[PDB]
């Protein structure tokens, strides 16, 4: 019911970030997608970020194919979150990016007058 529950996060942990922070879906695909982890077609299923990332990209394609089959709505662009998560969990490590989502969740949720001088990275 929650895609991020098992990886140690939740949808709200990614909701704390502004929607303009994530790169586009075309910038998540190609760049950072087929460049790194070219082996995603290996009969392997390495750490679950790989096997979830697969169904994620396949899902984006299975959306776009019907979308173009008709002719739009980017409210179904939440994959831009997903693809950012797993990839960032693969390249930068899962503990680090999860600690960043938590840390920025404590950036917002505090009054800006009380905020420390530095933002999380």
């Amino acid at each position: 019911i929650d895609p991020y529950k098992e990886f140690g996060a939740t949808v709200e942990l990614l909701s704390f970030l502004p929607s303009d922070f994530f790169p586009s879906v075309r910038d998540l695909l190609d760049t950072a997608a087929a460049l790194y982890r070219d082996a995603l077609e290996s009969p392997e299923h390495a750490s679950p970020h790989h096997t979830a990332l697969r169904q994620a990209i396949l899902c984006w394609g299975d959306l776009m194919t019907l979308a173009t089959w008709v002719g739009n709505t980017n409210v179904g662009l939440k994959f831009r979150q997903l693809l950012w998560f797993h990839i960032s969990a693969l390249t930068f490590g899962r503990e680090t990016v999860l600690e960043y989502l938590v840390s920025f969740g404590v950036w917002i949720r505090t009054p800006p007058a009380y905020r420390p001088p530095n933002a999380p990275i």
Partner: antibody
Framework: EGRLVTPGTPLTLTCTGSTYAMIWVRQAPGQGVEYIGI?????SASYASWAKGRFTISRTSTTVDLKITSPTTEDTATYFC????????????????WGPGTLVTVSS | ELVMTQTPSSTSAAVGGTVTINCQAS??????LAWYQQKPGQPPKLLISAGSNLASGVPSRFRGSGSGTEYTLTISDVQREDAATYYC??????????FGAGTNVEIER
């Protein structure tokens, strides 16, 4: 490892290691750890509701200080200081480095 | 003001058995919870950071989990070195933080 002060006399405990975002905690003998407050990389000190006005958290380039003003008999406990790990600065939710702690007894 | 309610108090586990602590938050901290270990006469030793993170050398038998206002720390393979008091903190904001009441874990023998 210990400090003795008669009730009402203010005291100051110092903690060292540079400057990033240090917090203080107190633990009474036989009791659990009690959060006190942070001081961020900019010198902004944030306190818990119960400890507001009872304690004061300062800092300098080489040191982070905690002063107890008009300490009562109930304030005898062991005091720990913990720095944020890495860059952080005051939104950090866990601090692995911890000073050994200093026990403070308030008595006549 | 944030307050954390820990819901084991004292517990009993045997070597090889499992023991579970849970930490409930009065307000949703969004994985800002972290679990600390402490033994008598020692400063608290950080066990887990955020939800699942096991920072540096800590036995993988310590497993953190939970989301929202509900969190859990499970000790799966229990060893006689595990007898100790465990705490959870969590942070709503950079302002308000509260430690839990503490859990006293004794080893069956």
């Amino acid at each position: 490892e210990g400090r003795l002060v008669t009730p009402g006399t203010p005291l100051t405990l110092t903690c060292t290691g540079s400057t990033y975002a240090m917090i203080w905690v107190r633990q009474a003998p036989g009791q659990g750890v009690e959060y006190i407050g942070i001081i961020n990389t900019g010198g902004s000190a944030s306190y818990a509701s119960w400890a507001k006005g009872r304690f004061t958290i300062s800092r300098t380039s080489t040191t982070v200080d905690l002063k107890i003003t008009s300490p009562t008999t109930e304030d005898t406990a062991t005091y720990f200081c913990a720095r944020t790990r890495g860059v952080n600065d005051a939104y950090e939710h866990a601090f692995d480095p911890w000073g050994p702690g200093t026990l403070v007894t308030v008595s006549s | 003001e944030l307050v954390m309610t820990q819901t084991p108090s004292s517990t009993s586990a045997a070597v090889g058995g499992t023991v579970t602590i849970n930490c409930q938050a009065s307000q949703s901290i969004g994985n800002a919870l972290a679990w600390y270990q402490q033994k008598p006469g020692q400063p608290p030793k950080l066990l887990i950071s955020a939800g699942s993170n096991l920072a540096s050398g800590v036995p993988s038998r310590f497993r953190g989990s939970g989301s929202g206002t509900e969190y859990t720390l499970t000790i799966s393979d229990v060893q006689r070195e595990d007898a100790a008091t465990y705490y959870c903190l969590g942070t709503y904001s950079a302002i308000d933080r509260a430690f839990g009441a503490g859990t006293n874990v004794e080893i069956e023998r």
